[PDB]
């Protein structure tokens, strides 16, 4: 038990030569008599002795060994943010969600201590940030900044999306994507960013509109009046964004709650070139609104001429 203490000391201090002189199949998984009662692997992991960790693992150290608190060496690596140690342990089969006596996982420890880098690693290896410790608190609950909380949430949703795709779980893919911010709806009037972008008076509105669509915005989204972005753009003669909507397959004949197309609204506002653009995109001038009107029947003579030309 005198050589044991020397071995544990070699592990804590990173003394490779002394470790290998003292390490045998009989003491590789010994515990300290006092303190945390760590194994050499606990010590090497907690004090970031990468090389010692590798040699212990090569010579039979048990990644599931416990200390006085139920910690495995992964807890020690993660709590102190030693990235490389953490990955080696995981490579040699450490349980990524191992629980100590208080049901803290390695992720609890890394998040608790603001070890951002290690949390991402743990999540890539299947760490569940929803698992609760004995106080019902999850790892996200323990992240001390809102930046880490949003990152933990992002990465866990990322990995969850990949698994659901592997299983062609249409319901779950559809679920998570619905909570993406690209389709956020204004609580009262239900417009999306795409409605707001095509109505903008600022000169980057075309590039914003293109970006939103590239990132998944629904080109035919209805607001509370069932207006699409095309309706909003057409009644304002924002022709530049209407071309973007068309290129992304906007439905030219979608109907608002009055049964009106985008072309009805362009004709009502008297926007001649807009009417022309809409016709060239395949707007159907024959559609009758719920109040009984075609576009031409709502427009002035110049509008009626455009629809006739």
């Amino acid at each position: 038990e005198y050589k044991k203490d020397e071995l544990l000391e070699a592990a804590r201090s990173g003394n490779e030569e002394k470790l290998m002189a003292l390490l045998t199949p009989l003491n590789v998984n010994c515990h300290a008599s006092d303190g945390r009662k760590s194994t050499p692997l606990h010590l090497a992991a907690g004090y970031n002795r990468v090389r010692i960790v590798q040699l212990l693992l090569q010579h039979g150290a048990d990644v599931h060994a416990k200390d006085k608190g139920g910690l495995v060496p992964l807890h020690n690596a993660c709590s102190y943010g030693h990235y490389e140690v953490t990955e080696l342990l995981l490579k040699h089969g450490a349980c990524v969600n191992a629980m100590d006596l208080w049901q803290f996982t390695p992720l609890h420890e890394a998040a608790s201590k603001n070890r951002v880098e290690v949390c991402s690693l743990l999540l890539s290896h299947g760490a569940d940030p929803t698992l609760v410790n004995c106080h019902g608190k999850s790892a996200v609950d323990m992240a001390p900044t809102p930046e880490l909380r949003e990152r933990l949430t992002y990465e866990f949703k990322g990995h969850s999306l990949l698994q659901a795709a592997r299983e062609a779980d249409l319901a779950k893919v559809k679920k998570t994507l619905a909570l993406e911010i690209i389709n956020f709806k204004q609580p009262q009037s239900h417009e999306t960013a795409l409605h707001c972008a095509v109505a903008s008076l600022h000169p980057k509105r075309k590039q914003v509109t293109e970006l939103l669509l590239r990132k998944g915005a629904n080109v035919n989204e209805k607001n509370k009046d069932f207006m699409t972005p095309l309706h909003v753009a057409a009644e304002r003669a924002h022709n530049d964004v209407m071309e973007v909507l068309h290129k992304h397959g906007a439905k030219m004949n979608a109907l608002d709650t009055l049964g009106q197309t985008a072309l009805h609204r362009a004709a009502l506002a008297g926007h001649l070139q807009t009417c022309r653009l809409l016709l060239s995109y395949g707007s159907d001038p024959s559609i009758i609104s719920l109040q009984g009107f075609t576009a031409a029947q709502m427009g002035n003579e110049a509008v009626q001429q455009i629809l006739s030309e």
């Binding site: 945390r36 010590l43 992991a45 006085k68 020690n76 690596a77 709590s79 420890e109 201590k113």
Partner: peptide
């Protein structure tokens, strides 16, 4: 509940 052996 103490902490585990190690250092940051």
């Amino acid at each position: 509940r103490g902490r585990g052996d190690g250092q940051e």
